[PDB]
Design a binder for these strands. Structure first.
Ligand SMILES: [Zn+2]
Ligand SMILES: [Zn+2]
Ligand SMILES: [Zn+2]
Ligand SMILES: [Zn+2]
Ligand SMILES: [Zn+2]
Length: 113
DNA sequence: CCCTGCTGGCACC
DNA sequence: GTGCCAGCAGGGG
């Protein structure tokens, strides 16, 4: 990684990667949504914007361990890691003595009180 | 450079 | 308290 950034410690082997990184410092947003004229730093981010808001018949992602539906697959990963990650020694209920080894089931029981 | 997944601020009303 | 959102960089090539 010979290409070194001038304003921070980021470095890369490709010129495209540094040109893209420089947008974080310059605040440049060269991509614009042709419907609401919203600006974005990267083109892939713009495609996700058009899909999630302006595109009809979108296929969201359903969680396998509960009934929550999520629009983005990456946000489903956050859900799985945050809500359904196993807890070796479960956390006690705030009200009663019930114990749960997954965060989602713990909150759903506390809301039942 | 397109595709992909991760990150943290922030509506939620 | 968490999904939504744009920001963001790595991988492959
Ligand atoms: Zn930099
Ligand atoms: Zn738009
Ligand atoms: Zn779930
Ligand atoms: Zn309880
Ligand atoms: Zn479980």
């Amino acid at each position: 990684s010979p290409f070194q950034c001038s304003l921070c410690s980021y470095a890369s082997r490709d010129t495209y990667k540094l040109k893209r990184h420089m947008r974080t410092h310059s605040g440049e947003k060269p991509y614009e949504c042709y419907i609401c004229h919203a600006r974005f730093t990267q083109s892939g981010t713009m495609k996700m914007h058009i899909l999630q808001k302006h595109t009809e018949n979108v296929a969201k992602f359903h969680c396998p361990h509960c009934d929550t539906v999520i629009a983005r697959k990456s946000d489903l990963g956050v859900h799985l890691r945050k809500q359904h990650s196993y807890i070796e020694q479960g956390k006690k209920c705030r009200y009663c003595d019930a114990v749960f080894h997954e965060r989602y089931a713990l909150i759903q029981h506390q809301k039942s009180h």
